[PDB]
Amino acid sequence: FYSLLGVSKTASSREIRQAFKKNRAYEVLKDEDLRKKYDKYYYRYDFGIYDDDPEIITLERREFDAAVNSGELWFVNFYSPGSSHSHDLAPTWREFAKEVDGLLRIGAVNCGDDRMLCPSLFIFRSGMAAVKYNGDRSKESLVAFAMQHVRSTVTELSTGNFVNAIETAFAAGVGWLITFCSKGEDCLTSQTRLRLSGMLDGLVNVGWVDCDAQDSLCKSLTTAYFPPGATLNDREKSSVLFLNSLDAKEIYMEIIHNLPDFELLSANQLEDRLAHHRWLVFFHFGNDPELKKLKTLLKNEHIQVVRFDCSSAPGICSDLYVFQPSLAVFKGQGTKEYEIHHGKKILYDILAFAKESVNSHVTTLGPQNFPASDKEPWLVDFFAPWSPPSRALLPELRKASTLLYGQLKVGTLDCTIHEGLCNMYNIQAYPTTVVFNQSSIHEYEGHHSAEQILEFIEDLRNPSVVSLTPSTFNELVKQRKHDEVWMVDFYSPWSHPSQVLMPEWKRMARTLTGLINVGSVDCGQYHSFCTQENVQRYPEIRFYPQKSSKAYQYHSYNGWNRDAYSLRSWGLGFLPQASIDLTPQTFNEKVLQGKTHWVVDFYAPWSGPSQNFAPEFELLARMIKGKVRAGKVDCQAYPQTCQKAGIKAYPSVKLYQYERAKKSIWEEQINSRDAKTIAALIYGKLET
């Protein structure tokens, strides 16, 4: 199924596509939510246009904002399927991205796959506003426009300045790439050294020497990189990089490979630094050279980039459960608060990971810091780094955590490392997100989105079942407004039938939002008040009706079944009738020969399923009042009427739509037995 497409269960959407582009399994695997459930239980030119072009990052909605604001210059192509002006550009955009590899990031957004997110071209860089490109579509044009947004210093060097640049290099820890030009000869072009300046901004100084002007200087030897401390003289010549190429890319690659690695820290140095500052740390034991750009680009987020040799002090690493070379970002509290980067070690993605992580509140958990016997609310994500859905969840959790600061604590647990711990929470799939709150444990089953995770947390925070006090019972229930109704569960934690009821009580309540207020009263904690209210058995279910001329404070449910459907049905049963009871004559006159929309319940009094649906039908009648009228035909009293309406069994529901233009009624069967569903279905049909 994975290997039917010929990929691994570690495959990205991109690789699923590139492999698909050669069915069923694809539809399952492409869609993140259908891939979830499986994991534990035109094509030539219009599909995955940029899949095979690896210097183009195709961007989705969830990651877009973090990616383009991660710090590199970004140039994004917003396109569409079908749009032949998007097809027109694809070959150019591939070239263009190849041409500027190392200078800026090239991205593609498929507005076909998400218009929500959206033949257009834009430029993005952290801390500007986006700028919309308007020129023609050529490579050389797009290059230039990118260039006018790239910070580049090229400095012309006299003999005096060359020597001083050279001598002050070492103290500055920034070397010089210098081209040497005399006529009759070829040297780097002015646009080239500008491009090199951009590619190596913050890493190397770019300059040039006019060898006609600087005669003596140039007879000490064409482009040369000088590591800081290197010079043209005999003593140091041997570490100068001497190059002949006229091509920016080629020169750049030599330089980037050649640049020093990150500052190495001793154990002492690291503990000192981690205590209060933000650090990106490369752990190794005894990488794309592009990562060396990390230092420049995280400058303004005050994150310093460093590396650490685990082998020089293995205890620092083993306490962090770092067993393999890894990248961590620390957010300023020793080793308490850090996250480990998962996924491919690309500059833009490490950039986004680092800024998002230090600005959020996700903790890396292990056995000791695992919130065990901590009853304060916790949100824990159990995951495995190899899991594409697990990796996608992590940023959404960072987002959610910034909104939850001081409300609940967020952490991740790497099950690949802490298998024991994952086994003891019965984690059967990656990721599994769980809220811990007062001895209770709730598992999230929604879409991996900050929005939806937050919705789910807010719903735990204000549950559908209002947990009542003797005081909130008096304010909320006793003194309810006249048209409010309440259902209350008087329970004890030590009652079996109570423990059985609670989950049914909760499912019922969620269903009744906006219709019936639902509460519960712990008679263990509030004994004398439960005695006051004359509660004799646990559990005891009471309905507090609309206040009216009747003398009944409440009703006790005494029915045999205490499942959610039975209770929903019992409660909805007290609410007012809004349908009318039709006879054969009123049915013909008002529905068949009428000028309005009707919904009609054809039922029989002896019918269990008729009785069970009756309160549901009255809810429908109430909801739709003003747009559609509701009727009931008793098929027992009137079998003749029911037969002519084609009623086989009970209950049946029919929809009647009046179309004024045709002076006629259209008749339709409804198979849903859910008020909300029927209502939508009806409104949906009334405008068409």
Q: Can you describe this structure?
A:
The chain is an alpha/beta fold and 688 residues long. It has 6 domains: 49-154, Glutaredoxin; 155-260, Glutaredoxin, CATH 3.40.30.10; 261-360, Glutaredoxin, CATH 3.40.30.10; 361-462, Glutaredoxin, CATH 3.40.30.10; 463-575, Glutaredoxin, CATH 3.40.30; 576-688, Glutaredoxin. The protein has a 5-stranded mixed β-sheet, covered by helices on one side. Strands 6-8-7-9-10 form a 5-stranded mixed β-sheet, sandwiched between helices. It has a 5-stranded mixed β-sheet with strand order 11-13-12-14-15. Strand 22, helix 20 (496-512) and strand 23 form a beta-alpha-beta unit. Helix 6 (84-99) packs across helix 7 (139-147), helix 20 packs across helix 22 and helix 22 crosses helix 24 (608-624). The protein is elongated. The PDB classes it as oxidoreductase. The entry lists the keywords PDI family, thioredoxin, endoplasmic reticulum, oxidoreductase. The assembly is monomeric. Crystal structure of full-length ERdj5. The protein: DnaJ homolog subfamily C member 10.
